[PDB]
Design an enzyme around this catalytic site. Structure first.
Site, mmCIF file in Angstrom:
data_model
loop_
_atom_site.group_PDB
_atom_site.id
_atom_site.type_symbol
_atom_site.label_atom_id
_atom_site.label_comp_id
_atom_site.label_asym_id
_atom_site.label_seq_id
_atom_site.Cartn_x
_atom_site.Cartn_y
_atom_site.Cartn_z
ATOM 1 C CB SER A 1 -4.358 5.749 4.746
ATOM 2 O OG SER A 1 -3.897 4.455 4.411
ATOM 3 C CG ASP B 1 -1.749 8.260 2.434
ATOM 4 O OD1 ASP B 1 -2.879 8.625 2.821
ATOM 5 O OD2 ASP B 1 -0.712 8.891 2.718
ATOM 6 C CG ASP C 1 -2.299 2.513 6.176
ATOM 7 O OD1 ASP C 1 -3.124 3.359 6.587
ATOM 8 O OD2 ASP C 1 -2.008 2.371 4.967
ATOM 9 C CG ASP D 1 -1.732 1.257 1.299
ATOM 10 O OD1 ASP D 1 -1.699 2.048 2.270
ATOM 11 O OD2 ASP D 1 -2.464 1.417 0.312
HETATM 12 MG MG LIG Z 1 -2.784 3.331 3.131
#
Ligand SMILES: [Mg+2]
Length: 234
Positions: free
Chosen positions: A159, A10, A194, A8
Protein backbone atom coordinates in the site's frame (compact mmCIF):
# COMPACT_ATOMS: atom_id res chain seq x y z
CA UNK A 1 -22.31 -22.12 6.30
CA UNK A 2 -19.28 -20.10 7.32
CA UNK A 3 -18.84 -16.58 5.96
CA UNK A 4 -15.25 -15.51 6.12
CA UNK A 5 -13.58 -12.38 4.98
CA UNK A 6 -9.85 -11.66 4.61
CA UNK A 7 -9.20 -8.00 5.37
CA UNK A 8 -6.08 -6.12 4.48
CA UNK A 9 -5.43 -3.21 6.85
CA UNK A 10 -3.36 -0.29 5.56
CA UNK A 11 -5.26 1.70 2.92
CA UNK A 12 -8.04 -0.89 3.06
CA UNK A 13 -9.64 -1.10 6.51
CA UNK A 14 -8.46 2.27 7.76
CA UNK A 15 -7.40 5.60 6.23
CA UNK A 16 -4.22 5.75 8.24
CA UNK A 17 -2.87 4.18 11.39
CA UNK A 18 -5.57 4.84 14.00
CA UNK A 19 -7.96 1.89 14.63
CA UNK A 20 -11.07 3.90 15.51
CA UNK A 21 -12.52 4.27 12.01
CA UNK A 22 -12.64 0.48 11.72
CA UNK A 23 -14.67 -0.15 14.87
CA UNK A 24 -18.05 0.24 13.07
CA UNK A 25 -16.84 -1.93 10.18
CA UNK A 26 -15.75 -4.79 12.48
CA UNK A 27 -18.98 -4.55 14.54
CA UNK A 28 -21.10 -4.68 11.38
CA UNK A 29 -19.15 -7.60 9.92
CA UNK A 30 -19.49 -9.45 13.20
CA UNK A 31 -23.26 -8.80 13.29
CA UNK A 32 -23.48 -10.16 9.75
CA UNK A 33 -21.87 -13.34 11.08
CA UNK A 34 -18.42 -13.04 9.52
CA UNK A 35 -15.15 -14.62 10.61
CA UNK A 36 -12.77 -11.68 10.12
CA UNK A 37 -9.18 -12.61 9.19
CA UNK A 38 -6.60 -9.80 8.99
CA UNK A 39 -4.11 -10.52 6.20
CA UNK A 40 -1.69 -7.65 6.11
CA UNK A 41 1.96 -6.89 5.48
CA UNK A 42 2.00 -5.55 9.06
CA UNK A 43 3.96 -7.49 11.68
CA UNK A 44 2.33 -9.74 14.24
CA UNK A 45 3.04 -7.10 16.90
CA UNK A 46 1.22 -4.48 14.84
CA UNK A 47 -1.75 -6.67 14.12
CA UNK A 48 -2.12 -7.69 17.79
CA UNK A 49 -2.58 -4.01 18.60
CA UNK A 50 -5.34 -3.66 15.96
CA UNK A 51 -6.95 -6.93 17.05
CA UNK A 52 -7.07 -5.90 20.71
CA UNK A 53 -8.27 -2.43 19.80
CA UNK A 54 -11.05 -3.83 17.60
CA UNK A 55 -11.80 -6.93 19.71
CA UNK A 56 -10.98 -9.36 16.90
CA UNK A 57 -9.85 -12.76 18.26
CA UNK A 58 -9.72 -14.81 15.07
CA UNK A 59 -6.66 -16.23 13.25
CA UNK A 60 -4.54 -13.66 11.37
CA UNK A 61 -1.80 -13.62 8.76
CA UNK A 62 1.30 -11.45 8.85
CA UNK A 63 3.99 -9.95 6.67
CA UNK A 64 2.51 -10.93 3.30
CA UNK A 65 1.46 -14.45 4.26
CA UNK A 66 4.79 -15.26 5.92
CA UNK A 67 2.99 -16.73 8.92
CA UNK A 68 -0.50 -17.76 10.03
CA UNK A 69 -1.34 -17.23 13.69
CA UNK A 70 -4.15 -19.37 15.13
CA UNK A 71 -5.25 -18.77 18.73
CA UNK A 72 -4.46 -21.73 20.97
CA UNK A 73 -7.57 -23.90 21.05
CA UNK A 74 -9.34 -21.87 18.37
CA UNK A 75 -10.41 -24.82 16.21
CA UNK A 76 -12.44 -27.76 17.59
CA UNK A 77 -1.06 -18.92 19.24
CA UNK A 78 -0.27 -21.87 16.99
CA UNK A 79 2.06 -20.45 14.34
CA UNK A 80 2.45 -21.80 10.82
CA UNK A 81 5.60 -20.28 9.32
CA UNK A 82 5.68 -20.08 5.53
CA UNK A 83 8.20 -17.34 4.81
CA UNK A 84 11.83 -16.71 5.68
CA UNK A 85 13.34 -15.20 8.81
CA UNK A 86 14.00 -11.46 8.62
CA UNK A 87 17.69 -11.85 9.60
CA UNK A 88 18.34 -13.70 6.35
CA UNK A 89 16.74 -10.87 4.43
CA UNK A 90 18.75 -8.25 6.31
CA UNK A 91 21.96 -10.16 5.58
CA UNK A 92 21.37 -9.68 1.90
CA UNK A 93 20.04 -6.10 2.19
CA UNK A 94 23.22 -5.25 4.09
CA UNK A 95 25.32 -6.34 1.12
CA UNK A 96 23.22 -4.20 -1.23
CA UNK A 97 22.66 -1.28 1.10
CA UNK A 98 25.47 0.94 -0.11
CA UNK A 99 25.25 -0.17 -3.73
CA UNK A 100 21.63 0.90 -4.09
CA UNK A 101 21.20 3.50 -1.34
CA UNK A 102 18.62 1.33 0.47
CA UNK A 103 16.73 2.50 3.55
CA UNK A 104 14.65 -0.07 5.45
CA UNK A 105 13.64 -0.76 9.05
CA UNK A 106 16.91 -2.34 10.06
CA UNK A 107 19.09 0.60 9.00
CA UNK A 108 16.78 3.53 9.75
CA UNK A 109 16.13 5.45 13.00
CA UNK A 110 12.75 5.69 14.72
CA UNK A 111 12.72 9.27 13.46
CA UNK A 112 13.39 8.24 9.86
CA UNK A 113 10.77 5.54 10.04
CA UNK A 114 8.18 8.04 11.30
CA UNK A 115 8.98 10.43 8.48
CA UNK A 116 8.99 7.66 5.86
CA UNK A 117 5.78 5.97 6.99
CA UNK A 118 3.79 8.78 8.56
CA UNK A 119 3.34 6.44 11.50
CA UNK A 120 2.25 7.71 14.88
CA UNK A 121 5.36 7.72 17.11
CA UNK A 122 3.97 5.36 19.75
CA UNK A 123 3.20 2.70 17.11
CA UNK A 124 6.66 2.63 15.46
CA UNK A 125 8.00 0.06 17.96
CA UNK A 126 5.44 -2.55 16.79
CA UNK A 127 6.42 -1.94 13.17
CA UNK A 128 10.08 -2.47 14.10
CA UNK A 129 9.32 -5.94 15.49
CA UNK A 130 9.82 -7.68 12.18
CA UNK A 131 9.91 -11.43 11.85
CA UNK A 132 9.81 -12.32 8.18
CA UNK A 133 10.18 -9.25 6.02
CA UNK A 134 11.58 -5.81 5.39
CA UNK A 135 10.20 -2.68 3.77
CA UNK A 136 12.25 -0.60 1.35
CA UNK A 137 11.52 3.06 2.20
CA UNK A 138 13.84 4.41 -0.48
CA UNK A 139 16.72 3.78 -2.83
CA UNK A 140 19.06 5.95 -4.87
CA UNK A 141 19.70 3.54 -7.74
CA UNK A 142 17.47 1.03 -9.55
CA UNK A 143 18.26 -2.66 -9.88
CA UNK A 144 18.11 -4.05 -6.35
CA UNK A 145 14.77 -5.80 -6.92
CA UNK A 146 16.14 -7.98 -9.74
CA UNK A 147 19.09 -8.82 -7.50
CA UNK A 148 16.89 -9.86 -4.57
CA UNK A 149 14.64 -11.94 -6.84
CA UNK A 150 17.62 -13.85 -8.19
CA UNK A 151 18.71 -14.40 -4.60
CA UNK A 152 15.54 -16.32 -3.84
CA UNK A 153 13.50 -13.46 -2.29
CA UNK A 154 10.15 -11.98 -3.23
CA UNK A 155 9.69 -8.24 -3.74
CA UNK A 156 6.08 -7.06 -3.68
CA UNK A 157 4.70 -3.54 -3.79
CA UNK A 158 2.32 -2.85 -0.91
CA UNK A 159 0.00 0.00 0.00
CA UNK A 160 2.96 2.37 0.51
CA UNK A 161 6.31 0.67 -0.10
CA UNK A 162 7.87 -2.45 -1.52
CA UNK A 163 8.10 -5.39 0.87
CA UNK A 164 10.95 -7.90 0.74
CA UNK A 165 9.92 -11.33 1.95
CA UNK A 166 10.35 -15.05 1.53
CA UNK A 167 8.73 -17.91 -0.35
CA UNK A 168 5.08 -17.14 0.43
CA UNK A 169 2.32 -14.60 -0.17
CA UNK A 170 -1.14 -13.62 1.11
CA UNK A 171 -2.86 -16.25 -1.06
CA UNK A 172 -0.73 -19.24 -0.11
CA UNK A 173 -1.36 -18.38 3.51
CA UNK A 174 -5.11 -17.73 2.93
CA UNK A 175 -5.50 -21.02 1.06
CA UNK A 176 -3.97 -22.96 3.93
CA UNK A 177 -6.12 -21.22 6.53
CA UNK A 178 -9.26 -21.71 4.41
CA UNK A 179 -8.68 -25.49 4.59
CA UNK A 180 -9.01 -25.33 8.37
CA UNK A 181 -12.43 -23.76 8.06
CA UNK A 182 -13.49 -26.23 5.39
CA UNK A 183 -13.13 -29.04 7.90
CA UNK A 184 -16.00 -27.32 9.70
CA UNK A 185 -18.42 -26.89 6.83
CA UNK A 186 -19.13 -25.03 3.61
CA UNK A 187 -17.51 -21.62 3.21
CA UNK A 188 -18.39 -18.41 1.43
CA UNK A 189 -15.08 -16.52 1.16
CA UNK A 190 -14.41 -12.81 0.56
CA UNK A 191 -11.21 -10.76 0.33
CA UNK A 192 -10.74 -7.01 0.55
CA UNK A 193 -7.45 -5.31 -0.35
CA UNK A 194 -5.92 -2.33 -2.13
CA UNK A 195 -2.55 -3.17 -3.65
CA UNK A 196 -0.37 -5.71 -5.40
CA UNK A 197 0.40 -7.58 -2.23
CA UNK A 198 -3.32 -8.40 -2.08
CA UNK A 199 -3.59 -9.99 -5.55
CA UNK A 200 -2.55 -13.46 -4.35
CA UNK A 201 -5.58 -13.43 -1.99
CA UNK A 202 -8.04 -12.65 -4.73
CA UNK A 203 -7.10 -15.84 -6.51
CA UNK A 204 -8.29 -17.93 -3.56
CA UNK A 205 -11.65 -16.47 -2.52
CA UNK A 206 -15.16 -16.44 -4.01
CA UNK A 207 -15.75 -12.71 -3.88
CA UNK A 208 -13.11 -9.97 -4.17
CA UNK A 209 -13.17 -6.21 -3.44
CA UNK A 210 -10.46 -3.63 -4.08
CA UNK A 211 -10.61 -0.35 -2.20
CA UNK A 212 -9.33 2.30 -4.59
CA UNK A 213 -8.49 2.29 -8.31
CA UNK A 214 -5.98 -0.53 -8.73
CA UNK A 215 -7.71 -2.89 -11.16
CA UNK A 216 -7.78 -6.70 -11.01
CA UNK A 217 -9.71 -9.25 -13.07
CA UNK A 218 -11.61 -11.12 -10.35
CA UNK A 219 -12.06 -7.87 -8.40
CA UNK A 220 -14.82 -5.33 -7.90
CA UNK A 221 -13.52 -1.81 -7.20
CA UNK A 222 -15.02 0.45 -4.54
CA UNK A 223 -14.08 3.77 -2.94
CA UNK A 224 -14.09 2.66 0.65
CA UNK A 225 -14.47 -0.18 3.13
CA UNK A 226 -17.97 1.15 4.02
CA UNK A 227 -19.03 0.47 0.44
CA UNK A 228 -17.82 -3.12 0.74
CA UNK A 229 -20.23 -3.62 3.62
CA UNK A 230 -23.15 -2.03 1.78
CA UNK A 231 -22.61 -4.28 -1.24
CA UNK A 232 -22.38 -7.35 0.97
CA UNK A 233 -25.77 -6.61 2.61
CA UNK A 234 -27.30 -7.92 -0.64
MG1 LIG B 1 -2.98 -2.42 2.17
Amino acid sequence: MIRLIFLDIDKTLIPGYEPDPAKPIIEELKDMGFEIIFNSSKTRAEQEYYRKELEVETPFISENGSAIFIPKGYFPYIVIELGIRVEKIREELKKLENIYGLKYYGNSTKEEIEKFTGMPPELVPLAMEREYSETIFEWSRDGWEEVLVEGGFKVTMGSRFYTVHGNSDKGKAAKILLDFYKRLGQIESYAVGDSYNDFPMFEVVDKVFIVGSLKHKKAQNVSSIIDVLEVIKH
